[PDB]
C-alpha cells in the first residue's frame, strides 16, 4: 500500500502575549506519531505512537530544537501576514502548515507536499514540481515573490525528497507491526420505526481500524444509490472507529434489503440484514 508522512503545524496568535501557541503534529500513514505543543509545562516533541519510543533522546532533542525554531518562524510569519492583510489587531490569528511526502507501495517517492493557510483559507502552496509556488490572493503574492527571491522552494524540495523520505522509511520499518495492524468492524442492523408505514434500517459498523470503510445497502442484488443516509466516520475514542448507513424502506419488506460492510480488517466482506427477535 501507499505511505505518507505529514507535519500539521498550527500557530494561533494570542492577543497581548507576543508568542503564539505552536502545535506541530506528525502523522505517518494518517496516524499521529509525534506531537509538539508550546502550551505544555515543558514543551518538547512527544512520542504519539508506541514504535516512536525506539528513538534515542537525541531524536527528541533534534526535533524539540527544530520546534523552537518554527515557533519563531510562525511568530514572524504571523506578524508579516497581519501586516499584508491590515489586521494590526489583538484578535487571534491562525496560520497553519501541511508539509510532507507520499510514497508508492515500493516506498519510492511519489510527491512532495507543502501547503500553508491563513485564517482557514489557503494562503500559499508549493506545486507538485517542488519548484514553483501558487498564491491564493494579492497578499499571498508578496510571500510568493519573497520566496521566489529567497529560493526557499529549493530547501523544501531538498527536505521533501530527502529527509522526509529517508525518515519515513525508518518510521515504516520501525512501526511495521503497529502500521500493518487492523481491527475488524463488528456490524448489526437496527430497526427504527416511522410515519407513512416506513422503517429506517441502520447498518452499524463498530470498533474498526483503519477509518476507511464502505457501507452499502442492497435491495435484492441492486446497490442503493440515494435512499441511503451516511454518517461521517467517527472515532470510538479507544483508537477504533464507527460508521453507520441507514435506508428508509417500506414496512414488512424489511428482509428484501441487505447491508454489506467492506473493510480491509475483515477476513471477507460482512453481509447482514435485519434480525427480528
Amino acid at each position: 500500500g501507499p505511505h505518507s508522512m505529514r507535519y500539521f503545524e498550527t500557530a494561533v496568535s494570542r492577543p497581548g502575549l507576543e508568542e503564539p501557541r505552536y502545535i506541530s503534529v506528525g502523522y505517518v500513514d494518517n496516524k499521529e506519531f509525534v506531537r509538539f505543543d508550546s502550551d505544555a509545562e515543558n514543551p518538547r516533541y512527544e512520542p504519539r505512537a508506541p514504535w516512536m519510543e525506539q528513538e534515542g533522546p537525541e531524536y527528541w532533542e533534534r526535533e524539540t530544537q527544530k520546534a523552537k525554531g518554527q515557533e519563531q518562524w510562525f511568530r514572524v510569519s504571523l506578524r508579516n501576514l497581519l501586516g499584508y492583510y491590515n489586521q494590526s489587531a489583538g484578535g487571534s490569528h491562525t496560520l497553519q502548515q501541511m508539509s510532507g511526502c507520499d510514497l508508492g507501495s515500493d516506498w519510492r517517492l511519489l510527491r512532495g507536499y507543502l501547503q500553508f493557510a491563513y485564517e482557514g483559507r489557503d494562503y500559499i502552496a508549493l506545486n507538485e514540481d517542488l519548484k514553483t509556488w501558487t498564491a491564493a490572493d494579492m497578499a499571498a503574492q508578496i510571500t510568493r515573490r519573497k520566496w521566489e527571491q529567497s529560493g526557499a522552494a529549493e530547501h523544501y524540495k531538498a527536505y521533501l525528497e530527502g529527509e522526509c523520505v529517508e525518515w519515513l522509511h525508518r518510521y515504516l520499518k520501525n512501526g511495521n507491526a503497529t502500521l500493518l495492524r487492523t481491527d475488524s468492524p463488528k456490524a448489526h442492523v437496527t430497526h427504527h420505526p416511522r410515519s407513512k408505514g416506513e422503517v429506517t434500517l441502520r447498518c452499524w459498523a463498530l470498533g474498526f481500524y483503519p477509518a476507511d470503510i464502505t457501507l452499502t445497502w442492497q435491495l435484492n442484488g441492486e446497490e442503493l444509490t440515494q435512499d441511503m443516509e451516511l454518517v461521517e466516520t467517527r472515532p470510538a475514542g479507544d483508537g477504533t472507529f464507527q460508521k453507520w448507513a441507514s435506508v428508509v424502506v417500506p414496512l414488512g419488506k424489511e428482509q428484501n434489503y441487505t447491508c454489506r460492510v467492506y473493510h480491509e480488517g475483515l477476513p471477507e466482506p460482512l453481509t447482514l440484514r435485519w434480525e427480528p427477535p
Binding site: 507535519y7 510569519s77 500553508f116 526557499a152
Partner: peptide, 9 residues
C-alpha cells in the same frame, strides 16, 4: 522528522 521553514512569509 520535521522540517524547518527558511524565509518567513
Amino acid at each position: 522528522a520535521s522540517n524547518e521553514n527558511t524565509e518567513t512569509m
